[PDB]
């Protein structure tokens, strides 16, 4: 399970084994993470241009 | 001496002839610079800024410690004392 | 030699005045006059201080004066009199002007435009007293002289903007004298000080001066706070008019910082937090602004412990403001850990300092937040937890008492648990996965509107200075 | 060059007194011998600075404190005379040579070399100021790029030599600029090992980890501490940053680490600890957590600052991996797992869970550990919003600021 | 001040007023009034009678109704005029708890309701419940019903389109902004 090579969780509160094949994550939503990162990149250099004005 | 990230307001604002009086007025309104009043006021100089390595001078990064007590002495006592219980089990 | 030095200082001032005089003869304006006026005030503040105590006096004598020149000179007598450079050739002139306050014309009285001149000689006498760093009777005499002059006739738009900056100094010098050595007549004269400030705001409403209105609002908030008349200030802040159109960014920094004080007292910690961050981002990084920032940071730490939010340890370490902020750093560690014993030490160790800033009142409310923060840590750490275990950890009383703390604490939602009194544990309600609920919908909407608002402010501001330049001849 | 990094290590043990008694005494013996041979006496004055009524002091030139556990750090007056004698002779003999070398023609080779030899002597005996000044001339003179990078690592070695992190930091930015300008592959490897130990000295262990695995593939034994010390640092950092999957592939795609096998006490302890984490049996982990503190962090110059930090972070990491693969645990089965007792465990957990940096809850009624770590899209949302709150904030301030001026 | 402005009667009179604001249950006003007093006596005539209202306000902010009831009960020993605000403040502790208990539980036996609400009589508990609108049926309360009624009232009032915030309403906002 640490390998994440089938999926599933090991349950010792009852002593069962859950096996899953369920959808997990979201690709479209994943790429949003980089896009905020890219917008945060651009403004650092914007603000170097804006300290020539103050 | 700069409030939050030091570089973030050092680039944000800089001096003007126009602004310089108003700034001085702001610090006078509170009534002092409030960093040179404080040693006289207490009648000591820092020893309680020497609480932790990071507190004194920031020449490291943050750990998220706030007492900096070695945790090796407690983890060692747990280790040996647990073994003995199992030995006497 | 000695005449040359006072003459040079005078000639600097004349060019700055003459610039504005020309500008207000075409059509009175607000902002173009101010930028020049702010530059002049800096030079006067530096020349009054550094170059003798009689360089103001030369100017005051040089122009026509109602009775000001004699009132100026009085102040100088006390600290070793001056008499030099008041003979003709400092009083046989009214100092280059084309014809609008020129020597030949004024003496002849074909015109007299003491209008602008009187307001500037006031500006000097206020600057000169704060330079000296003196108070006593000289303050009283400054209060008495300028106020009815300006109230026995309406001012033009330009003259109102000079007289807003005098009110701040009158107020500041009165308040410092009480703090050097409290007196019993300082108290009764404060009612007088109080009356003029609010009456001023009405006067500025009719002239439709944006920058005059804003600076008086900043004064009323400060004046209530040192008198502690918060009740009257709570009515005021829900009935304001502040513009942010022409105001300087120092005025805006101050305005937001005042709100944060009153709000914190009313047990609003969520609105106070928003506004104190506003005040800091306007302010410079400079040691010029240093003392404004310390008081601001003192309040900023305090608000977070009142919420349960608990400031960063980094925040003290990245600034060199550590020693000022030393008492709030000991509170930060105390509330986080849950240790009442640590907390009680901090407020006894540093009581005197806290009580100076009049932030001690705010600090005692934190004895509650240790207990409430302590229960939130224990509900995080154990989903279900006996009552007795809490009593050991936070050094509290019976379990019945602890039950009551939680029943109250979840009315604000601090703990976000609920008590079973027949099952004997406390069961928290968080088990996240709110992305399967409809919550993020609500959130994204708000950020989108926040962006729309910054777009709009971009539109009006971008073109207004552009418009001034393209109209203006420079071809 | 060679003996300087040896002495500084052994001196760091005497500066502390938390180190084993036999380790500290033997360390005293090695540094005293080298005072005679290499004139490390001026460096012996620096050790008293670090004390003043703090332990590990028994000095005779300074104040002797017998409330201390060190007593072999005598600053005798036999040593102090030996210094003045050796100091004078060497300055007189070397000066006379160099004056005449400068006079003979050729600035490109000869005059550059003659001044470098001045900086080698002052570097060697631990006078930083005089090494600095004479080696500044060497750089200015027309010399190859390789020579400059060399001299810059030599100045920066003195910062390691005083074990002041501050001096080092500046000098390694200078090499970092000049290494692209030289285009010399020979000393590029030297840069990696210096700069690895600098990331190690600061809390950037993501950067240190990449450097210290590269030091296995190429090591340089000129002015740089032992191959066993470089192996130990790689293991320390590898555990810090990398969890099972990443960590296993690192020490299985590292054959060089393996040839060195554990041949010193510091190296055992970290190497055994590695096995237990990524094998998913933390039975041995908890006793070894103590050993690694004892034999790596305390003796080293670059991890004693982080001694307490390391054990705090690692205690989270090992628990997290068990909690990830288990939707539920029993406190008892989990207590057996580490080799700890039930109550001891709750304490360690009670620190990690409020910062919410470990994501678990503990039913103490049922006895089970529930894991509320989201393994779905809720997790991704928890990343996103704190970045976007900041985005909003960053634009509000920069935009508002330019309108006003 | 220090010239016939400060007296023994003054210290007594302000003490009584602070209880007035607190027994009306305005803590907005109480804390804003406390500043004004900071400037005046609180270390120039120290707290010896003004400590009373300040202690009390604190104990309910941490949430301890034990410490709060005790401080009131020992002020009931002193039949003077301070006690005329003490009974108001014991009525207030009951109401606060009755605001809390909706989230806190769902079932309490009647002996348990009595315990939280500081009643010594089981009859007295039943009498407050009529007035406070708690349905005790077969000697057990039902907070889930009460919660419903109050929620229903809050849905009824006109706030309601953008209180909920409709899926449709969100996009309509976006649309006109880009075209404006």
Distance CA D82, CA D41 (A): 9
How many angstroms away from the CA of C444 is the closest CA of chain E? 10
Same structural domain for residues D19 and D63? Answer: yes
Residue D126 sits at the vertex; the CA angle it makes with D125 and D128, to the nearest 5 degrees, is 130
Structural domain including D69 reads 2-325
**C385 φ/ψ angles, rounded to the nearest 5 degrees:** -150, 135
Suggest the residue from B24, B28, B34 to mutate for an interface test with chain C (most C CBs closer than 10 A). B34
Q: Does residue D290 form part of some domain?
A: yes
Same structural domain for residues D93 and D239? Answer: yes
Cβ distance of B17 and C294 shorter than 8 Å: no
**A10 φ/ψ angles, rounded to the nearest 5 degrees:** -100, 120
Distance CA E177, CA E170 (A): 12
Distance CA E24, CA E57 (A): 13
The answer to whether C68 and C16 have CB atoms below 8 angstroms apart is: no
Neighbours of C367 (CB within 10 A): 16
Same structural domain for residues D128 and D216? Answer: yes
Neighbours of D219 (CB within 10 A): 17
Q: Which of D293, D307, D401 sits opposite B12 (nearest CB)?
A: D401
Distance CA C343, CA D316 (A): 28
Q: Does residue D401 form part of some domain?
A: no
Burial of B76 (0-12, 13-18, 19+ CB in 10 A): middle
Q: Which element (helix H / strand E) includes B1?
A: none
- Please tell me what DSSP assigns to residue A51: G
Distance CA E129, CA E142 (A): 12
Suggest the residue from B17, B32, B35, B59 to mutate for an interface test with chain C (most C CBs closer than 10 A). B35
Beta bridge partners of D362: D369
**Four-CA torsion E168, E170, E171, E176, nearest 10 degrees:** 120
* Neighboring chain C residues of D309 at a CB cutoff of 8 Å: none
Burial of D149 (0-12, 13-18, 19+ CB in 10 A): buried
The answer to whether B24 and C288 have CB atoms below 8 angstroms apart is: yes
- As a 3-state breakdown, chain A gives helix, strand, coil percent values, each rounded to 5, of 50, 10, 40
Distance CA D233, CA D209 (A): 8
Residue D99 sits at the vertex; the CA angle it makes with D98 and D101, to the nearest 5 degrees, is 60
Distance CA D131, CA D123 (A): 5
Q: Does residue D114 form part of some domain?
A: yes
Does C215 reach chain E within 8 Å, measured CB to CB? no
Number of domains present in the structure of chain B: 1
Does D309 reach chain B within 8 Å, measured CB to CB? yes
C-alpha distance across the termini of chain B, in Å: 61
> How many angstroms separate the Cα of E115 from the Cα of each of C7, C180, C239, C353, C422?
87, 56, 46, 44, 13
Distance CA C104, CA C181 (A): 50
The answer to whether D65 and D48 have CB atoms below 8 angstroms apart is: no
Neighbours of D301 (CB within 10 A): 21
Which of D359, E151, E63, D330 shows the shortest CA–CA distance to C419?
E63
**Four-CA torsion D141, D144, D146, D150, nearest 10 degrees:** -20
The answer to whether E109 and E126 have CB atoms below 8 angstroms apart is: no
The answer to whether C139 and C193 have CB atoms below 8 angstroms apart is: no
Which of C232, C220, C287, C280 shows the shortest CA–CA distance to C252?
C280
- Please tell me what DSSP assigns to residue E46: T
Q: What is the token pair recorded at E13?
A: 């009179």
Q: What is the token pair recorded at C444?
A: 């994204």
* Neighboring chain D residues of C440 at a CB cutoff of 8 Å: 381
Same structural domain for residues D330 and D262? Answer: no
Beta strands in C249-344 (DSSP E): none
Q: What is the token pair recorded at D318?
A: 């090992």
Q: Which element (helix H / strand E) includes A16?
A: strand A16-18
Cβ distance of C422 and E107 shorter than 8 Å: yes
Which of D138, D89, D83, D133 shows the shortest CA–CA distance to D114?
D138
Does D386 reach chain A within 8 Å, measured CB to CB? no
Q: What is the token pair recorded at D395?
A: 């634009």
**Four-CA torsion B16, B21, B24, B25, nearest 10 degrees:** -140
* Neighboring chain B residues of C324 at a CB cutoff of 8 Å: 34-35, 38
3-state SS class at C283:
coil
Burial of D31 (0-12, 13-18, 19+ CB in 10 A): buried
3-state SS class at C250:
helix
Same structural domain for residues D332 and D215? Answer: no
Cβ distance of C231 and E60 shorter than 8 Å: no
Interface of C with B in 384-423 (CB under 8 A): none
Chains that contact B by 3+ CB pairs under 8 Å? A, C, D
* Neighboring chain D residues of B57 at a CB cutoff of 8 Å: none
Burial of C158 (0-12, 13-18, 19+ CB in 10 A): buried
Same structural domain for residues D333 and D306? Answer: no
Q: What is the token pair recorded at D136?
A: 């500044």
Which of D130, D177, D123 shows the shortest CA–CA distance to D149?
D177
Q: Which of A47, A48, A54 sits opposite B13 (nearest CB)?
A: A54
Q: Which element (helix H / strand E) includes A9?
A: strand A9-11
- C441-475 burial code (b ≥16 CB/10 A, e <16): eeeebeeeeeeeeeeeeeeeeeeeeeeeeeeeeee
Suggest the residue from B18, B19, B63 to mutate for an interface test with chain D (most D CBs closer than 10 A). B63
Beta strands in C302-448 (DSSP E): 384-385, 417-420, 425-428
Q: Are strands D326-330 and A9-11 parallel, antiparallel or unpaired?
A: parallel
How many angstroms away from the CA of C72 is the closest CA of chain D? 36
* Neighboring chain B residues of A48 at a CB cutoff of 8 Å: 11
Q: Does residue B4 form part of some domain?
A: no
Does D385 reach chain C within 8 Å, measured CB to CB? yes
Cβ distance of A48 and B11 shorter than 8 Å: yes
- Please tell me what DSSP assigns to residue E3: S
The answer to whether D247 and D270 have CB atoms below 8 angstroms apart is: no
Q: What is the token pair recorded at D366?
A: 């049922």
Secondary structure in 3-state letters for chain D: CHHHHHHHHHHHHHHCCCCCHHHHHHHHHHHHHHHHHHCCHHHHHHHHHCCCCCCCCCCCCCCCCCCCCCCCCCCCHHHHHHHHHHHHHHHHHHHHHHHHHHHCCCHHHHHHHHHHHHHHHHHHHCCHHHHHHHHHHHHHCCCCHHHHHHHHHHHHHHHHHHCCHHHHHHHHHHHHHHHHHHCCCCCHHHHHHHHHHHHHHCCCHHHHHHHHHHHHHCCCCCCCCCHHHHHHHHHHHHHHHCCHHHHHHHHHCCHHHHHCCCCCHHHHHHHHHHHHHHCCCCCCHHHHHHHHHHHHHCCCCCCCCCHHHHHHHHHHHHHHHHHHHEEEEEHHHHHHHHCCCHHHHHHHHHHHHHHCCCCCEEECCCCEEECCCCCCHHHHHHHHHHHHHHHHHHHHHHHHHHHHC
What is chain E's alpha carbon radius of gyration, rounded to the nearest angstrom? 23
Beta strands in E71-125 (DSSP E): none
Same structural domain for residues D245 and D367? Answer: no
Distance CA D271, CA E29 (A): 66
* Neighboring chain D residues of B75 at a CB cutoff of 8 Å: 286, 289-290, 311
Cβ distance of B14 and A48 shorter than 8 Å: no
Number of domains present in the structure of chain D: 2
Query: DSSP characters for C169-181?
Result: HHHHHHHHHHHHS
How many angstroms away from the CA of C116 is the closest CA of chain B? 20
Distance CA D108, CA C82 (A): 71
Does C180 reach chain B within 8 Å, measured CB to CB? no
Quick one: how far is CA D149 from the chain centroid? 22
Burial of D214 (0-12, 13-18, 19+ CB in 10 A): middle
Q: What is the token pair recorded at C3?
A: 């005449």
Distance CA C143, CA C195 (A): 13
> How many angstroms separate the Cα of D189 from the Cα of each of C221, D146, D153?
64, 13, 12
Residues near D54 by Cβ (< 8 Å), separated by ≥ 6? none
Interface of E with C in 56-115 (CB under 8 A): 58, 60-67, 96-97, 99-101, 103-105, 107-109, 112, 115
Residue D95 sits at the vertex; the CA angle it makes with D89 and D98, to the nearest 5 degrees, is 140
Burial of D251 (0-12, 13-18, 19+ CB in 10 A): buried
Q: Which element (helix H / strand E) includes C190?
A: helix C185-207
Distance CA D376, CA D359 (A): 14
Q: What is the token pair recorded at D405?
A: 């001026």
Q: Does residue B6 form part of some domain?
A: no
Distance CA D160, CA D198 (A): 9
Q: What is the token pair recorded at D18?
A: 């938390």
3-state SS class at C243:
coil
CB-based touch B/E (3+ pairs, under 8 A): no
**D52 φ/ψ angles, rounded to the nearest 5 degrees:** 45, 115
Q: Give, to the nearest 10 degrees, the angle between helix C31-50 and helix C2-26.
A: 170
The residue of chain A with its CA nearest to that of B9 is: A51
Q: Number of C-alpha atoms within 13 angstroms, CB side, residue D238?
A: 28
Same structural domain for residues D90 and D169? Answer: yes
How many angstroms away from the CA of D194 is the closest CA of chain B? 18
Distance CA C30, CA C158 (A): 7
Residue D311 sits at the vertex; the CA angle it makes with D306 and D313, to the nearest 5 degrees, is 90
What is the number of H-type helices and E-type strands within chain C? 23, 3
How many angstroms away from the CA of C401 is the closest CA of chain E? 6
Entry resolution (Å): 6.1
> How many angstroms separate the Cα of C429 from the Cα of each of C386, D180, E145, E148, E160?
16, 57, 20, 19, 27
Does C206 reach chain D within 8 Å, measured CB to CB? no
Cβ distance of E32 and C231 shorter than 8 Å: yes
Residues near C236 by Cβ (< 8 Å), separated by ≥ 6? C220, C221, C224
How many angstroms away from the CA of B87 is the closest CA of chain C? 30
3-state SS class at C321:
coil
Q: Are strands D326-330 and D368-370 parallel, antiparallel or unpaired?
A: antiparallel
Q: Does residue B46 form part of some domain?
A: yes
Q: What is the token pair recorded at C364?
A: 């005692």
Neighbours of B83 (CB within 10 A): 12
Same structural domain for residues D139 and D87? Answer: yes
> How many angstroms separate the Cα of C243 from the Cα of each of A52, C36, C255, D96, E110?
28, 22, 11, 79, 59
Cβ distance of C408 and E65 shorter than 8 Å: yes
Cβ distance of C409 and E63 shorter than 8 Å: yes
Quick one: how far is CA D56 from the chain centroid? 22
**B56 φ/ψ angles, rounded to the nearest 5 degrees:** -60, -60
- Please tell me what DSSP assigns to residue C428: E
Cβ distance of D381 and C457 shorter than 8 Å: no
Which of C31, D387, D405, D177 shows the shortest CA–CA distance to B11?
D405
Distance CA E114, CA D63 (A): 73
Distance CA E60, CA B54 (A): 38
In which residue are the tokens 């009581």 written? C351
Burial of C98 (0-12, 13-18, 19+ CB in 10 A): exposed
Q: Does residue B14 form part of some domain?
A: no
Structural domain including B54 reads 23-89
**Four-CA torsion A34, A39, A40, A42, nearest 10 degrees:** 130
Beta bridge partners of E140: E109, E137
Does D307 reach chain B within 8 Å, measured CB to CB? yes
Quick one: how far is CA D48 from the chain centroid? 22
Which of C126, C122, C150 shows the shortest CA–CA distance to C138?
C126
Q: Can you say whether residue E40 is alpha, beta or left, with left for phi > 0 and alpha for psi between -120 and 50 degrees?
A: beta
Beta strands in E7-160 (DSSP E): 136-137, 140-141
Distance CA C145, CA D297 (A): 73
Distance CA C287, CA D296 (A): 45
- As a 3-state breakdown, chain C gives helix, strand, coil percent values, each rounded to 5, of 70, 0, 30
What is chain A's alpha carbon radius of gyration, rounded to the nearest angstrom? 22
- Please tell me what DSSP assigns to residue C426: E
Distance CA D346, CA C336 (A): 18
Which of A2, B72, B71 shows the shortest CA–CA distance to D277?
A2
Does C441 reach chain E within 8 Å, measured CB to CB? yes
Q: Can you say whether residue C225 is alpha, beta or left, with left for phi > 0 and alpha for psi between -120 and 50 degrees?
A: alpha
> How many angstroms separate the Cα of D181 from the Cα of each of C343, D176, D192, E57, E147?
56, 9, 16, 70, 74
Cβ distance of A2 and D324 shorter than 8 Å: yes
Q: What is the token pair recorded at D212?
A: 């210290």
């Amino acid at each position: 399970i640490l390998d994440k090579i089938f999926y599933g969780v090991l349950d010792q509160g009852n002593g069962w084994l859950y096996v899953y094949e369920t959808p997990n994550q979201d690709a479209t939503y994943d790429s949003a993470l980089e896009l905020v990162g890219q917008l945060n990149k651009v403004v650092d250099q914007l603000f170097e241009k804006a300290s020539v004005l103050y | 001496m700069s409030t939050d990230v030091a570089a973030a307001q050092a680039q944000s604002k800089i001096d003007l002839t126009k602004k310089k009086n108003e700034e001085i007025n702001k610090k006078s309104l509170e009534e002092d610079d409030e960093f040179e009043d404080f040693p006289i006021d207490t009648w000591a100089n820092g020893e309680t800024i020497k609480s932790n390595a990071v507190t004194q001078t920031n020449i490291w990064e943050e750990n998220w410690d706030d007492v900096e007590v070695d945790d090796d002495f407690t983890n060692e006592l747990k280790a040996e004392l647990d073994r003995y219980k199992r030995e006497n089990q | 030699l000695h005449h040359s030095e006072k003459k040079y200082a005078e000639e600097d001032q004349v060019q700055e005045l003459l610039k504005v005089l020309n500008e207000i003869s075409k059509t009175t304006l607000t902002l173009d006059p101010r930028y020049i006026w702010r530059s002049l005030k800096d030079l006067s503040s530096l020349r009054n201080q550094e170059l003798l105590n009689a360089e103001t006096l030369c100017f005051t004598v040089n122009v026509l004066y109602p009775d000001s020149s004699s009132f100026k000179k009085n102040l100088l007598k006390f600290i070793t009199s001056n008499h030099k450079s008041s003979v003709p050739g400092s009083a046989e002139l009214r100092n280059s002007y084309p014809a609008s306050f020129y020597s030949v014309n004024t003496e002849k009285k074909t015109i007299e435009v003491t209008a602008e001149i009187n307001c500037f000689m006031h500006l000097l006498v206020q600057l000169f007293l704060w330079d000296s760093k003196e108070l006593e009777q000289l303050v009283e005499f400054n209060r008495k002289v300028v106020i009815p002059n300006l109230l026995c006739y309406y001012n033009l738009r330009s003259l109102n903007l000079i007289n807003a900056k005098l009110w701040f100094y009158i107020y500041l010098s009165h308040e410092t004298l009480a703090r050097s050595s409290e007196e019993i007549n300082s108290d009764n004269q404060n009612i007088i000080l109080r009356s003029t400030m609010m009456k001023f705001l009405k006067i500025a409403s009719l002239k439709h001066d944006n920058e005059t209105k804003a600076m008086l609002i900043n004064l009323i908030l400060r004046d209530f706070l040192n008198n502690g008349e918060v009740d009257s200030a709570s009515d005021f802040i829900s009935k304001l008019e502040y513009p942010h159109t022409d105001v300087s960014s120092s005025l805006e920094a101050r305005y937001f910082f005042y709100l944060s004080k009153i709000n914190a007292i009313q047990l609003d910690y969520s609105t106070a937090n928003e506004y104190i961050i506003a005040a800091i981002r306007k302010a410079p990084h400079n040691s010029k602004s240093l003392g404004f920032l310390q008081q601001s940071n003192k309040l900023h730490c305090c608000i977070q412990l009142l919420m349960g939010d608990i400031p960063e340890l980094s925040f003290f370490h990245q600034s060199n403001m550590q020693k000022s902020l030393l008492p709030y750093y000991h509170l930060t560690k105390a509330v986080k850990l849950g240790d009442l014993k640590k907390f009680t030490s901090t407020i006894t160790k540093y009581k005197q300092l806290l009580l100076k800033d009049d932030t001690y009142q705010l600090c005692v409310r934190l004895r509650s937040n240790v207990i409430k923060t302590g229960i939130r840590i224990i509900s995080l750490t154990y989903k279900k937890i006996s009552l007795r275990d809490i009593c050991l950890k936070l050094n509290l009383d019976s379990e019945q008492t602890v039950e009551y703390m939680v029943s109250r604490a979840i009315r604000d939602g601090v703990i976000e648990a609920k008590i079973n009194h027949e099952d004997g544990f406390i069961e928290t309600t968080e088990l996240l996965n709110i992305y399967d609920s409809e919550d993020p919908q609500q959130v994204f909407d708000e950020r989108i509107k926040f962006a729309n608002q910054l777009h709009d402010e971009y539109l009006v501001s971008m073109r207004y200075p552009e418009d001034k330049k393209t109209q203006q001849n420079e071809k | 060059r060679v003996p300087n990094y040896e002495v500084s290590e052994k001196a760091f043990l005497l500066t502390q007194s938390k180190v084993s008694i036999e380790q500290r005494k033997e360390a005293a013996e090695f540094v005293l011998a080298k005072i005679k041979e290499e004139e490390m006496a001026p460096y012996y004055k620096y050790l008293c600075e670090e004390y003043l009524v703090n332990n590990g002091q028994s000095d005779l030139e300074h104040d002797e404190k017998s409330d201390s556990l060190n007593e072999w750090i005598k600053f005798d007056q036999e040593l102090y005379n030996e210094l003045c004698k050796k100091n004078e002779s060497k300055i007189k003999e070397l000066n006379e040579k160099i004056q005449k070398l400068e006079e003979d023609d050729e600035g490109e080779l000869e005059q550059a070399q003659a001044w470098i030899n001045l900086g080698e002597y002052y570097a060697q005996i631990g006078d930083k100021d005089n090494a600095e000044k004479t080696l500044g001339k060497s750089l200015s003179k027309a010399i190859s790029t390789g020579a400059k990078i060399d001299v810059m690592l030599t100045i920066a070695r003195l910062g390691f030599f005083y074990n002041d992190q501050l001096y080092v930091k500046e000098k390694l930015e200078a090499v970092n600029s000049m290494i692209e300008k030289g285009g010399d592959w020979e000393r590029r490897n030297r840069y990696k090992t210096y700069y690895g130990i600098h990331c190690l000295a600061v809390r950037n262990f993501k950067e240190a980890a990449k450097l210290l695995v590269d030091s296995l593939a190429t090591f340089t034994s000129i002015e740089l501490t032992s191959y066993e010390s470089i192996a130990t640092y790689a293991s320390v950092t590898g555990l810090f940053t990398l969890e099972r999957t990443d960590l296993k592939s690192k020490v299985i795609d590292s054959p060089e680490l393996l040839s060195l096998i554990s041949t010193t006490a510091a190296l055992q302890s970290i190497s055994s600890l590695t096995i237990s984490l990524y094998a998913s049996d933390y039975a041995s982990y908890f006793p070894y957590l103590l050993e690694t503190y004892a034999n790596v962090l305390i003796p080293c110059k670059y991890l004693n600052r982080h001694a307490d930090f390391f054990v705090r972070e690692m205690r989270r990491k090992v628990y997290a991996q068990l909690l990830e693969s288990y939707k539920t645990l029993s406190l008892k089965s989990m207590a057996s797992a580490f080799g700890v007792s039930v109550a001891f465990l709750d304490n360690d957990l009670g620190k990690f869970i409020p910062n919410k940096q470990l994501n678990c809850v503990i039913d103490r009624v049922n006895g089970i550990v529930e894991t509320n770590r989201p393994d779905n899209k809720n997790a991704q949302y928890h990343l996103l919003v704190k970045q976007g709150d900041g985005l909003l904030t960053k634009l509000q301030k920069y935009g508002a600021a330019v309108r006003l001026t | 001040n220090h010239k016939l402005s400060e007296s023994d009667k003054k210290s007594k009179l302000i003490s009584l007023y602070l209880l007035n604001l607190l027994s009306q249950n305005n803590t907005t006003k109480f804390h804003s009034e406390l500043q004004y007093l900071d400037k005046h006596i609180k270390n120039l005539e120290d707290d010896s009678l003004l400590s009373y209202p300040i202690k009390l306000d604190r104990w309910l902010m941490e949430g301890s109704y034990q410490k709060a009831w005790d401080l009131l009960q020992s002020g009931s020993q002193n039949i003077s005029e301070f006690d005329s605000f003490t009974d108001i403040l014991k009525s207030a502790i009951r109401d606060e708890i009755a605001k809390n208990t909706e989230l806190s539980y769902d079932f309490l036996p009647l002996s348990n309701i009595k315990a939280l609400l500081f009643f010594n009589n089981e009859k007295e508990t039943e009498k407050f419940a009529l007035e406070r609108n708690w349905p005790i049926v077969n000697s057990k309360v039902y907070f889930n019903n009460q919660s419903k009624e109050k929620a229903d009232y809050e849905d009824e009032m006109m706030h309601e389109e953008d209180q909920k915030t409709n899926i449709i309403e969100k996009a309509m906002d976006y649309a006109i902004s880009i075209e404006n």
